[PDB]
Enzyme design. Sequence first.
Site, PDB file in Angstrom:
ATOM      1  N   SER A   1      70.738  43.964  33.489  1.00 55.02           N
ATOM      2  CA  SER A   1      72.106  44.303  33.196  1.00 55.02           C
ATOM      3  C   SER A   1      72.555  45.556  33.899  1.00 55.02           C
ATOM      4  CB  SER A   1      72.317  44.459  31.695  1.00 55.02           C
ATOM      5  OG  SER A   1      73.681  44.783  31.481  1.00 55.02           O
ATOM      6  N   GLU A   2      73.516  45.380  34.787  1.00 56.85           N
ATOM      7  CA  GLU A   2      74.183  46.470  35.456  1.00 56.85           C
ATOM      8  C   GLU A   2      74.923  47.351  34.449  1.00 56.85           C
ATOM      9  OE1 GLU A   2      73.676  47.123  38.610  1.00 56.85           O
ATOM     10  OE2 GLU A   2      75.244  48.632  38.968  1.00 56.85           O
ATOM     11  N   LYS A   3      75.296  46.806  33.274  1.00 53.61           N
ATOM     12  CA  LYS A   3      75.940  47.599  32.182  1.00 53.61           C
ATOM     13  C   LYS A   3      74.940  48.670  31.627  1.00 53.61           C
ATOM     14  CE  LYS A   3      78.036  46.542  27.720  1.00 53.61           C
ATOM     15  NZ  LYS A   3      78.058  47.878  27.019  1.00 53.61           N
ATOM     16  N   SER A   4      73.830  48.225  31.055  1.00 52.24           N
ATOM     17  CA  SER A   4      72.673  49.087  30.785  1.00 52.24           C
ATOM     18  C   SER A   4      72.239  50.071  31.876  1.00 52.24           C
ATOM     19  CB  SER A   4      71.459  48.243  30.415  1.00 52.24           C
ATOM     20  OG  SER A   4      71.598  47.661  29.127  1.00 52.24           O
TER      21      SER A   4
ATOM     22  N   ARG B   1      68.327  47.495  28.731  1.00 52.77           N
ATOM     23  CA  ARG B   1      67.769  46.575  29.733  1.00 52.77           C
ATOM     24  C   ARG B   1      68.298  46.791  31.186  1.00 52.77           C
ATOM     25  NH1 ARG B   1      71.426  41.044  28.288  1.00 52.77           N
ATOM     26  NH2 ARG B   1      73.415  42.172  28.078  1.00 52.77           N
TER      27      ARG B   1
ATOM     28  N   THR C   1      72.045  50.067  23.778  1.00 48.96           N
ATOM     29  CA  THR C   1      72.605  51.297  24.349  1.00 48.96           C
ATOM     30  C   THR C   1      74.127  51.202  24.474  1.00 48.96           C
ATOM     31  OG1 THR C   1      72.238  50.389  26.532  1.00 48.96           O
ATOM     32  CG2 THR C   1      70.462  51.702  25.554  1.00 48.96           C
ATOM     33  N   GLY C   2      74.718  50.283  23.689  1.00 53.38           N
ATOM     34  CA  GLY C   2      76.160  50.136  23.629  1.00 53.38           C
ATOM     35  C   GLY C   2      76.786  51.179  22.714  1.00 53.38           C
ATOM     36  N   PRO C   3      78.111  51.118  22.529  1.00 53.16           N
ATOM     37  CA  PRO C   3      78.776  52.114  21.683  1.00 53.16           C
ATOM     38  C   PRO C   3      78.339  52.076  20.237  1.00 53.16           C
ATOM     39  CG  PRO C   3      80.298  50.332  22.268  1.00 53.16           C
ATOM     40  CD  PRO C   3      79.085  50.225  23.188  1.00 53.16           C
TER      41      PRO C   3
ATOM     42  N   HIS D   1      86.212  32.883  12.983  1.00 48.08           N
ATOM     43  CA  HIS D   1      86.025  32.744  14.423  1.00 48.08           C
ATOM     44  C   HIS D   1      85.744  31.296  14.883  1.00 48.08           C
ATOM     45  CE1 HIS D   1      86.551  36.894  15.055  1.00 48.08           C
ATOM     46  NE2 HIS D   1      85.508  37.175  15.814  1.00 48.08           N
TER      47      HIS D   1
HETATM   48  N1  LIG Z   1      83.145  48.234  17.859  1.00 51.31           N
HETATM   49  C1  LIG Z   1      82.400  47.270  18.367  1.00 51.31           C
HETATM   50  O1  LIG Z   1      82.237  47.155  19.573  1.00 51.31           O
HETATM   51  C2  LIG Z   1      81.790  46.294  17.410  1.00 51.31           C
HETATM   52  C3  LIG Z   1      82.415  46.057  16.190  1.00 51.31           C
HETATM   53  C4  LIG Z   1      81.846  45.145  15.309  1.00 51.31           C
HETATM   54  C5  LIG Z   1      80.671  44.496  15.683  1.00 51.31           C
HETATM   55  N2  LIG Z   1      80.091  44.745  16.876  1.00 51.31           N
HETATM   56  C6  LIG Z   1      78.863  44.018  17.235  1.00 51.31           C
HETATM   57  O2  LIG Z   1      77.663  44.818  17.285  1.00 51.31           O
HETATM   58  C7  LIG Z   1      76.875  44.460  18.434  1.00 51.31           C
HETATM   59  C8  LIG Z   1      76.797  45.608  19.446  1.00 51.31           C
HETATM   60  O3  LIG Z   1      78.111  46.098  19.755  1.00 51.31           O
HETATM   61  P1  LIG Z   1      78.452  46.909  21.120  1.00 51.31           P
HETATM   62  O4  LIG Z   1      79.943  47.201  21.091  1.00 51.31           O
HETATM   63  O5  LIG Z   1      77.475  48.050  21.291  1.00 51.31           O
HETATM   64  O6  LIG Z   1      78.258  45.786  22.283  1.00 51.31           O
HETATM   65  P2  LIG Z   1      77.439  45.947  23.668  1.00 51.31           P
HETATM   66  O7  LIG Z   1      77.701  47.223  24.439  1.00 51.31           O
HETATM   67  O8  LIG Z   1      77.650  44.636  24.394  1.00 51.31           O
HETATM   68  O9  LIG Z   1      75.998  46.155  23.008  1.00 51.31           O
HETATM   69  C9  LIG Z   1      74.969  45.189  22.866  1.00 51.31           C
HETATM   70  C10 LIG Z   1      73.700  45.913  23.280  1.00 51.31           C
HETATM   71  O10 LIG Z   1      72.616  45.001  23.238  1.00 51.31           O
HETATM   72  C11 LIG Z   1      72.268  44.582  24.580  1.00 51.31           C
HETATM   73  N3  LIG Z   1      71.995  43.119  24.589  1.00 51.31           N
HETATM   74  C12 LIG Z   1      70.760  42.573  24.429  1.00 51.31           C
HETATM   75  N4  LIG Z   1      70.814  41.218  24.466  1.00 51.31           N
HETATM   76  C13 LIG Z   1      72.112  40.887  24.642  1.00 51.31           C
HETATM   77  C14 LIG Z   1      72.869  39.627  24.770  1.00 51.31           C
HETATM   78  N5  LIG Z   1      72.236  38.436  24.703  1.00 51.31           N
HETATM   79  N6  LIG Z   1      74.210  39.732  24.949  1.00 51.31           N
HETATM   80  C15 LIG Z   1      74.864  40.916  25.012  1.00 51.31           C
HETATM   81  N7  LIG Z   1      74.238  42.097  24.911  1.00 51.31           N
HETATM   82  C16 LIG Z   1      72.894  42.143  24.723  1.00 51.31           C
HETATM   83  C17 LIG Z   1      73.411  45.051  25.469  1.00 51.31           C
HETATM   84  O11 LIG Z   1      73.028  45.304  26.820  1.00 51.31           O
HETATM   85  P3  LIG Z   1      74.147  45.689  27.926  1.00 51.31           P
HETATM   86  O12 LIG Z   1      74.780  46.993  27.461  1.00 51.31           O
HETATM   87  O13 LIG Z   1      73.330  45.841  29.188  1.00 51.31           O
HETATM   88  O14 LIG Z   1      75.103  44.492  27.940  1.00 51.31           O
HETATM   89  C18 LIG Z   1      73.848  46.321  24.724  1.00 51.31           C
HETATM   90  O15 LIG Z   1      73.026  47.456  24.987  1.00 51.31           O
HETATM   91  C19 LIG Z   1      77.571  43.260  19.046  1.00 51.31           C
HETATM   92  O16 LIG Z   1      77.104  42.042  18.474  1.00 51.31           O
HETATM   93  C20 LIG Z   1      79.009  43.426  18.627  1.00 51.31           C
HETATM   94  O17 LIG Z   1      79.690  42.167  18.626  1.00 51.31           O
HETATM   95  C21 LIG Z   1      80.629  45.613  17.745  1.00 51.31           C
HETATM   96  C1  LIG Z   2      85.760  42.191  19.781  1.00 50.75           C
HETATM   97  C2  LIG Z   2      84.470  41.850  19.012  1.00 50.75           C
HETATM   98  N1  LIG Z   2      84.718  41.325  17.622  1.00 50.75           N
HETATM   99  C3  LIG Z   2      85.435  42.089  16.540  1.00 50.75           C
HETATM  100  C4  LIG Z   2      86.467  41.187  15.839  1.00 50.75           C
HETATM  101  C5  LIG Z   2      87.846  41.431  16.420  1.00 50.75           C
HETATM  102  N2  LIG Z   2      88.728  40.411  15.826  1.00 50.75           N
HETATM  103  C6  LIG Z   2      90.074  40.972  15.468  1.00 50.75           C
HETATM  104  C7  LIG Z   2      90.741  40.092  14.359  1.00 50.75           C
HETATM  105  C8  LIG Z   2      92.288  40.088  14.214  1.00 50.75           C
HETATM  106  C9  LIG Z   2      93.056  39.204  13.425  1.00 50.75           C
HETATM  107  N3  LIG Z   2      94.381  39.506  13.579  1.00 50.75           N
HETATM  108  C10 LIG Z   2      94.453  40.564  14.433  1.00 50.75           C
HETATM  109  N4  LIG Z   2      93.191  40.914  14.810  1.00 50.75           N
HETATM  110  C11 LIG Z   2      90.776  41.112  16.796  1.00 50.75           C
HETATM  111  O1  LIG Z   2      91.025  40.039  17.531  1.00 50.75           O
HETATM  112  O2  LIG Z   2      91.093  42.219  17.214  1.00 50.75           O
HETATM  113  C12 LIG Z   2      84.526  42.676  15.467  1.00 50.75           C
HETATM  114  O3  LIG Z   2      83.416  42.211  15.239  1.00 50.75           O
HETATM  115  O4  LIG Z   2      84.931  43.718  14.724  1.00 50.75           O
HETATM  116  C13 LIG Z   2      83.480  43.003  18.929  1.00 50.75           C
HETATM  117  O5  LIG Z   2      82.373  42.874  18.250  1.00 50.75           O
HETATM  118  O6  LIG Z   2      83.601  44.072  19.464  1.00 50.75           O
END
Ligand SMILES: NC(=O)c1ccc[n+]([C@@H]2O[C@H](COP(=O)([O-])OP(=O)(O)OC[C@H]3O[C@@H](n4cnc5c(N)ncnc54)[C@H](OP(=O)(O)O)[C@@H]3O)[C@@H](O)[C@H]2O)c1
Ligand SMILES: C[C@H](N[C@@H](CCN[C@H](Cc1c[nH]cn1)C(=O)O)C(=O)O)C(=O)O
EC number: 1.5.1.52
Lengths: 428, 428
Positions: free
Chosen positions: B36-39, B32, B8-10, B215
């Site tokens: 999770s207070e975030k959820s 969840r 339920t994240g972005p 990373h």
């Molecule tokens: N723009 C971005 O944010 C971005 C960019 C590239 C890749 N990603 C990757 O795509 C995935 C989801 O991104 P997101 O921004 O939606 O992040 P997020 O809000 O932290 O979403 C993760 C979702 O899965 C749940 N979850 C289940 N098990 C978990 C665990 N062990 N740790 C953390 N969260 C868990 C979270 O619950 P809660 O909301 O209750 O924590 C949340 O609903 C992540 O792996 C992230 O690294 C994100």
């Molecule tokens: C923050 C976290 N990870 C990013 C990577 C973010 N790394 C870049 C990499 C970078 C290299 N030089 C400048 N920025 C950053 O630190 O902003 C992703 O999966 O797209 C996420 O999943 O939201």
Amino acid sequence: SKLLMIGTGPVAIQLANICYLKSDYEIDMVGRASTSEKSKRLYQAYKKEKQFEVKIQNEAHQHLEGKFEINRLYKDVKNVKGEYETVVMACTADAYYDTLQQLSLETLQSVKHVILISPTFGSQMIVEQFMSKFSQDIEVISFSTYLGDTRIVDKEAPNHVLTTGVKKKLYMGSTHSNSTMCQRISALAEQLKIQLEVVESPLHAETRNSSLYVHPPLFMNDFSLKAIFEGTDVPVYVYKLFPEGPITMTLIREMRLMWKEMMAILQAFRVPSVNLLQFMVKENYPVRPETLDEGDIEHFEILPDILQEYLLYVRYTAILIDPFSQPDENGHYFDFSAVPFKQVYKNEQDVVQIPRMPSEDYYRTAMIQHIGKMLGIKTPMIDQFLTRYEASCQAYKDMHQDQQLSSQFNTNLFEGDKALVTKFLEIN
Amino acid sequence: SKLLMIGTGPVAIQLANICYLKSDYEIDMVGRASTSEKSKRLYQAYKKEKQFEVKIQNEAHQHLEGKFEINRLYKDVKNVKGEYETVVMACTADAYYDTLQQLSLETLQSVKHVILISPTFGSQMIVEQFMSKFSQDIEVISFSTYLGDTRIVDKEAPNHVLTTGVKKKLYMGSTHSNSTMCQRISALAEQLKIQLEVVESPLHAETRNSSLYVHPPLFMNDFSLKAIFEGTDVPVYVYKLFPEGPITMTLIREMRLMWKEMMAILQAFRVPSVNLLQFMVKENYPVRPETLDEGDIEHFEILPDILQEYLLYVRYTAILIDPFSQPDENGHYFDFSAVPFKQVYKNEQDVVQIPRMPSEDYYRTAMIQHIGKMLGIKTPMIDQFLTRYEASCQAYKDMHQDQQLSSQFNTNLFEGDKALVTKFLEIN
Ligand SMILES: NC(=O)c1ccc[n+]([C@@H]2O[C@H](COP(=O)([O-])OP(=O)(O)OC[C@H]3O[C@@H](n4cnc5c(N)ncnc54)[C@H](OP(=O)(O)O)[C@@H]3O)[C@@H](O)[C@H]2O)c1
Ligand SMILES: C[C@H](N[C@@H](CCN[C@H](Cc1c[nH]cn1)C(=O)O)C(=O)O)C(=O)O
Ligand SMILES: NC(=O)c1ccc[n+]([C@@H]2O[C@H](COP(=O)([O-])OP(=O)(O)OC[C@H]3O[C@@H](n4cnc5c(N)ncnc54)[C@H](OP(=O)(O)O)[C@@H]3O)[C@@H](O)[C@H]2O)c1
Ligand SMILES: C[C@H](N[C@@H](CCN[C@H](Cc1c[nH]cn1)C(=O)O)C(=O)O)C(=O)O
């Protein structure tokens, strides 16, 4: 007991105070009013106060300060008369010939020692060969560099100078190994608490100057040359990475290359080579131990070409900041990198001057190019530095036909100096 | 026509808007509250407004915005019931197993497609093997990465998200080459004007993620690990050079090494290798042409080891600033380098959490270590990354006996996942 000091800049004044307090010489100094409003301010200022002054910033350098008066300030070189046992060249290395040749026959015959404060590579050969028409056994002495940093704080009081830094190590070579003069300098050096290293010959000392290897690739490339002659839209900086400055894998390759053309020449003269990186790191500005491997610094000369470039690149990146300075509360260190280029400029008689960087590097490089030919050694990177500089001058000429320009723009200078090296080298 | 979105994240909300506007699925989502207070904020916020919203920043991404309502928001995974044809994993890759295993037998038997949005390397194998106890011909799909950057601007309205960037290129692999699903994604991709590349398998797509290679050396070294677990006297930064940050010839060697351990593994699976540098430069952030030679970028894989490190080092130094940004009047560019480390932190129930960097890299690395053993391949640099991370956790435990700590600190997690890869690999 008579000494002639050629120069009225801050180097000359610092050295004159040293001779005044710690030698038995009557000291005369010589600039140029026939030629320079800078020299004329100095002459006018000395004339008024009847005193020079060295002050210091860091109090570890006490020995070097002092107020003093010399025996005679000459206004211009041609005014010099009479006999002088010792001559100290405290002017730019590209004026050594020009300035000696203006002295009288009487004066030149009296000279026993010529001491060269900021020689380039080959300066002793030029000066030994020229002096050979007058003395028979002239002693010529070369330092690696001037002993520190002296400057004028106030242009209006140019007889008052400030020595801010002193070098960790200088080198010193004489045509006459272990001369009386050599031993007198050494003794003097430890009075002043300045580590001095004596080396086999003057040439040897003249190659222990980092600027020899570093200034030419840094300033004689298209980026730098544009910044100096043309200007840029936003300020750029000597020590920054492209596009903030010239430093680039290309630039670093050109530095390794020019460094090796140089070590080819020095093998011929049987002079040891310079570990460029060790020089840089252990004698100029230090970096954190985590930045460079001690074994790579130490073995630098035997390591692969690409690795040598890597190491150099990294050195420059490490000194973008002063890694030993006191970071502020945001983790930010002093921007040690932000040294502007000096640009071409009009003197007070509206004549266009080229600044010391790269004017003097043209000279240094032109000399090493000429040594190179005569010795049967290649120098394509040198040739390239010079071509680039000659092209920017010409371009400046084509682009600024309505402006008065200095002789620095002209080709091809230093004929006398070249001839003198030619002659010297035929003989050995 | 039923779709289950896990997350339920972005990311999940953006993807849900895409399925809402351009698919025929009834969409349920699951977070969840048990955990999770975030959820729980999200669930409470959706419950109030009965609407999610995606907004955009750059208007080139119109297709992706929109306000919408889904069929059912589940509060917790165990609450899920009934049949779902397609399941989208929009959670972290280290929760894929944990979360699937909580679903009912009925639910798991209905599933035909599992789509993995931010898989690590090996995620499809884990998910294919686990799903094999329920479907017989499960389709599993892997992307390289999420399609861009979505975030919550305001924590208080977490049902409102902002997609700021979109990636230049994504990759996509299926267990079922050229499936209906594969073609539906492709069609969808060009609706959204997102270049998508289809590759032979999911593994293949999972290795087209720069973070895999970058990373681990960046975060699993003593400098970084100290900054995260202990703190520092002055702020330090992820992308800066030592001592402002971790980047160092050492760090770059560790990255080349881990990159090659990886290309050993991929040769075994007959998957093409990654030109790491080309990936970096032509697909992430661009540098000026003068900084790197096109021929070195292009031939990167055949070039000597030392040269590969040089090139990588230089890449990082080039991105200290944004070399294409608008410099100010002093020649100074945006400090693109100044990304702080996230430090260990206490959630609102006072339990110590380790941030995503390096939590998730522990997972990724642990998996590649386990693939490595099973396949008869070496990984000493991987082993070293993990040792370092395990040591800092333990150290944190020893140093903070009076504090409540998360399961992230414990050894040795991921047994189920490891077993599943073990099993998968025996079979082929
Ligand atoms: N723009 C971005 O944010 C971005 C960019 C590239 C890749 N990603 C990757 O795509 C995935 C989801 O991104 P997101 O921004 O939606 O992040 P997020 O809000 O932290 O979403 C993760 C979702 O899965 C749940 N979850 C289940 N098990 C978990 C665990 N062990 N740790 C953390 N969260 C868990 C979270 O619950 P809660 O909301 O209750 O924590 C949340 O609903 C992540 O792996 C992230 O690294 C994100
Ligand atoms: C923050 C976290 N990870 C990013 C990577 C973010 N790394 C870049 C990499 C970078 C290299 N030089 C400048 N920025 C950053 O630190 O902003 C992703 O999966 O797209 C996420 O999943 O939201
Ligand atoms: N701390 C330092 O400044 C420092 C450090 C290391 C090395 N050095 C080197 O040591 C030498 C003297 O240093 P300085 O600071 O005393 O510089 P300076 O004030 O420019 O001194 C040079 C002296 O020689 C004269 N001169 C004769 N021919 C010249 C020519 N072609 N170009 C420029 N000047 C000429 C100058 O006359 P005007 O005074 O009329 O110009 C001046 O009196 C220079 O080569 C300098 O690069 C200086
Ligand atoms: C300014 C001119 N040349 C200097 C060299 C100055 N170069 C250093 C070199 C440097 C490298 N990184 C930071 N500073 C500088 O630009 O301040 C000298 O001969 O001691 C001079 O002779 O006064």
